[PDB]
Symmetry: C3
Subunit: 343 residues, 3 copies
């Protein structure tokens, strides 16, 4: 009954204050690339099948505007590719999909809403930002109907190989919404993530987990929230690694076309009796020229503990860290969304 | 005069009863992936050029809904990419194309019609199923006009390198149709298939051939057919390998929305005086929720000779065989087709 | 305010008279592939933002019709991927873009207009033809407004890594147009081109430069031009290489549907006190069956100095040279353009 072509183009100039060079000294990194959202194009549709029943699909491909290449592991529909049925009693979808972490926790974070890439937590450790390979393959997802503001669901992501536990995943989450208040909680687990090309997580072991909970509130021109997440690697005789992230964010619309957002995140990682931590704060001014086009300017600052180095997530996990405990990232950019409904 | 965007999304849950693990024991394989048809999207068009003359093109890309990646060798338009001219005296098309085996024999098989992937013959040995890299590169194809139900044509697929015979192919076939009766025969040959990146067959030698003939009949709610194919590798001092496939299939529409199909295939492979064989039978129930959406359920069973192992084709030739002479594949899935004509 | 889907399909049969085989003897190369233009599909749009201000984008992907694969380095939007703002005072665009060489010199060449691939200069040495990886990544481009027929602009292409000069590029050019007269000049420089995956030029060092100038004139059914370009590799203790290209071209419309073009190019390359040269002449007959479809036939002939070998550019830099000082390339082909404006 409807097939929509859509996309988002986001390009900006970014300065990063200190990025290690091969000579070991720190220099600034200048780049052109996605500032807030990862660029993408997609096809989505829904067919009315009568009785509240609908067939739905989404095919969504992320790419780097700087070089035209696929990212998120490099496949065609590297963000989402799924088909399913929606009814009054819930939705079941099959394919490559984001999991409950993304459905129920990301909307409570700056990186998952107005902030995007550079507001991600260190190394995107809790998989909240999707400018990065965070979708899961071979996924069956159930999403409940809305029960008076309560929604819940989960995923199982098959290994697609004769070893059932070798690169699979699952998750569960729930949200509660009421007149501007949003609460969410989620739990996700992977076994042998990235261990092969058939399973749930693309290459790049043991057990990896993300869980968290938070809440946000919106009224008028003001919105804000709090969010806790933990990412954990265990069952490796390597020592367990765990990272906790504590974020507060607020966004205020000065005018209907000018939003300013501020976010702060404290991250604390522990392994084998030792601990490192990062403090990150960012501010973003975003100006809408139309419903489809906005220009933005932002600056993010991160300081690590003295036994560690700073690195603001820029969409590329291979980016070398700062040589110091400090890094600044400042971006000016342009974002354009397009949309065709095929009447 | 018309450009159409289209696609097919097919996702299902498959159980395969016995697939070898690295430890050598057989375990079940559970997977999410294409059940019947390979998922694909495409662009096709035809321009009226006057006098019965038309310009036509098809750009068609297959992909795995489970992980969003291209398959069929991994290129962009990995199923078909061609442009050509159609007239009252026949059609000439240029590009990456299926050959006469696919045009004239596949419609007589369950795997090429209602059955799809898991109804393919062992290892897709006769290239009848297109959930697999069976298109040929660099192809010039002629298709005749309809001469009172007779159609014929063929292909030559260039090596695109200074060695004219190093990775090239050609084929020829013909069909006869009359009021529900269909007859087809075809012959295809490749030399040094997959020996380079420029030629007709993608990587993954000597002379490889497929030929076959069959017939089918449709009237009312009932359709069925018989088909013989042989695949042959020779001119290798390695010993010639040949495989013969004998298939019978029948499909019956219980209701206008519920089809049940049954297929049986006997396959016999011979090499260096020794012989192996497979018996395969499958049943599929397919229920149309609309013209665009259907849900299906099927079960396939294969038994090999005692000097061999069972393996039901699942779209992935790297899938390990069963550790026994038996394998069962059962699938429940969802298929959705979309279409936009751009009025 | 508008999003357009578009594409060009170009397929032809090419004979090349002498291409080296591994045995060292020269044989003819027969191929199916792009004759004139590289096949491509794309999405482009522009939104009216009021006051002469517009948001624009182009996403353009080149591919080989012969095998369905991406070319131009193999990424998704491997020809152009950019977003930007256009105003009365000029245009700024960000992403993967052609540089000033392509904007201001290519329109004065046969290879950049009616001639295409096989009219390129030896090894596409001056990057004038786009059936080849000539776009630059991470590019900021400014294009001025038209000042009474004068247009100018330039590019800077970031390295996107902490070494600012390690795989970056920039360019500048200008044109002057008046009633069929066109003049252009351009200059482009890259440092450490292809040295990494983050920078301006895709893999496949020191300083590489292209510059040139030319003019063309069109009136009625007749058009022609002259163009000089130089490509230079220096700062390598390897010896500097430089190549100068001198081209004359003319195209005449016999009828409104039949164009004949002739081009001649002399190329002279010098390195370490030695010199090689090539003479190339080509003729193309192009017949429009409609505004969207044309069939063409052409022949190109190249003779090299006796200390070198002939090689007519065919879109593939890995193609081996002729074993002699001579090579002929003859092509017959079909080109079809499509277009949908989404009203
Ligand atoms: O739809 C499927 C979602 O269900 C999520 C529950 O996860 C499956 C149970 O796995 C937990 C231990 O295997
Ligand atoms: O259109 C071309 C189709 O023609 C098919 C015939 O194949 C060419 C002959 O090759 C057989 C031995 O080379
Ligand atoms: O818009 C940017 C285009 O400007 C082109 C000028 O190039 C920058 C200067 O670089 C020359 C030496 O670095
Ligand atoms: Na209309
Ligand atoms: Na459309």
């Amino acid at each position: 009954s409807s097939v929509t072509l859509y996309g988002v183009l986001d390009a900006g100039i970014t300065y990063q204050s200190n990025v290690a060079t091969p000579s070991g000294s720190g220099k600034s990194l200048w780049s052109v690339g996605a500032g807030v959202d990862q660029s993408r194009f997609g096809l989505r549709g829904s067919e009315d099948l009568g009785g509240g029943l609908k067939a739905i699909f989404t095919l969504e491909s992320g790419f780097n505007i700087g070089n035209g290449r696929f990212n998120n592991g490099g496949g065609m529909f590297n963000r989402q590719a799924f088909v399913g049925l929606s009814s009054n009693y819930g939705t079941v979808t099959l394919g490559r999909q984001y999991d409950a972490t993304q459905d129920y926790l990301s909307p409570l974070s700056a990186t998952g809403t107005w902030g995007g890439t550079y507001f991600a937590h260190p190394l995107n450790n809790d998989r909240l930002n999707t400018n990065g390979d965070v979708a899961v393959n071979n996924t069956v997802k159930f999403t409940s109907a809305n029960y008076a503001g309560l929604q819940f669901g989960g995923t199982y992501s098959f290994s697609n190989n004769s070893q059932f536990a070798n690169n699979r995943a699952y998750s569960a989450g729930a949200s509660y919404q009421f007149q501007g208040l949003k609460v969410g909680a989620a739990y996700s687990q992977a076994n042998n993530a990235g261990a092969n090309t058939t399973g749930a997580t693309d290459p790049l072991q043991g057990r990896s987990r993300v869980y968290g909970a938070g809440a946000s509130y919106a009224y008028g021109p003001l919105q804000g929230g709090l969010l806790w997440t933990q990412s954990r690697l265990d069952n490796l005789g390597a020592p367990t690694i765990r990272a906790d992230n504590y974020e507060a964010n607020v966004k205020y619309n000065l005018t209907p076309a000018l939003g300013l957002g501020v976010a702060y995140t404290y991250t604390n990682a522990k392994a084998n009796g030792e601990s490192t931590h990062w403090n990150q704060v960012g501010v973003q001014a975003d100006y809408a020229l139309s419903k489809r086009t906005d220009v933005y300017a932002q600056a993010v600052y991160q300081r690590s503990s003295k036994n560690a180095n700073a690195s603001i997530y820029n969409g590329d996990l291979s980016t070398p860290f700062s040589t110091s405990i400090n890094q600044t990232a400042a971006t000016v950019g342009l974002r354009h969304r397009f949309h065709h409904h095929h009447h």
